[PDB]
Amino acid sequence: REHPFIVTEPGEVARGKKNGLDYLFHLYEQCREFLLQVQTIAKDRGEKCPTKVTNQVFRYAKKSGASYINKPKMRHYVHCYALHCLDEEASNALRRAFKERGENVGSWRQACYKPLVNIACRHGWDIDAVFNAHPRLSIWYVPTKLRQLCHLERNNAVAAAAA
Amino acid sequence: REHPFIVTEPGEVARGKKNGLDYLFHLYEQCREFLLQVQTIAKDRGEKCPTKVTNQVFRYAKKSGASYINKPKMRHYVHCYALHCLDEEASNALRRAFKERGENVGSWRQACYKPLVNIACRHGWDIDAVFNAHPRLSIWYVPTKLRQLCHLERNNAVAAAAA
DNA sequence: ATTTAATCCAATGGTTACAA
DNA sequence: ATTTAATCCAATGGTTACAA
Secondary structure: OOOOEOOOOOOOOOOOOOEOHHHHHHHHHHHHHHHHHHHHHHHHOOOOOOOOOOHHHHHHHHHOOOOOOOHHHHHHHHHHHHHHHHOHHHHHHHHHHHHHOOOOHHHHHHHOHHHHHHHHHOOOOOHHHHHHOOOOOOOOOOOHHHHHHHHHHHHHHHHHOOO | OOOOEOOOOOOOOOOOOOEOHHHHHHHHHHHHHHHHHHHHHHHHOOOOOOOOOOHHHHHHHHHOOOOOOOHHHHHHHHHHHHHHHHOHHHHHHHHHHHHHOOOOHHHHHHHOHHHHHHHHHOOOOOHHHHHHOOOOOOOOOOOHHHHHHHHHHHHHHHHHOOO
């Protein structure tokens, strides 16, 4: 079992048997690299070429010895990486604030949803399109919970423009 | 069981318990329409929206009473529809030629591969990209056999440019 | 009382074995 | 001798039930 994450500020190294949030984000960067490698091979073989991080890419990460990578964990934190990509400044501020308050990782993760929904609102509530417009982010499936929140919010907003 | 197809020339109506090739191509147009309808609903519900004809679209076609549509048959003839889309003139000529010669449908279908491979050759051997550049065609998965032929051919051509 | 990662599941793209 | 469409299958995206 890997050491658990804790909330850290940008650049901070976590003390003890813990990992910090810059390490978490680096894990996404590593999966991206694995995808590039799977695409290179698929194209060279004339096989169908994935455009997202799939089960195919997780098997490849494992085979390459990155045993500390697994799908359930990457899916769990994808929306946190999304915020870091889409608005780094706001990602940084939210980390600093959660650290200073002594919150746990589970709590900080829940807080990442709201600013994403707000970004969606400024782009026609189309969050699939927001993801696809960012080169780092276009290869990640939109998490269901996040898609649900954007839809709930759009229905609340249109109910409100009936005024 | 639907009546079987036979090779016909553009505009020809098939006599007897038979269907012609314009009817076959019209079946693809109908699946496209079903996809548009599935996309409309997915987007309105904030659910993930398919970009290809999937199992989801075949279930929808059936439910809507288009019982004569089925996945195995649509996958079987997709490359023939591709040629009709990408180079209609050449599609027409090949039908006229196969009719006049008395060939069966299975035989005409095999002949559709070659001109597709030639189209791929003029676009960097990237047949996924050829499909995606045509609005009618971008929603169909590239059939495996066709992807294999384009790859075999590219390897033959690069072996040949060693001269 | 929290956080992690193995397990399981319905549905998928693709094919085979069969029927007419 | 041909042509059609039911059936089956390994692998997928997604989640749950569990362990540490």
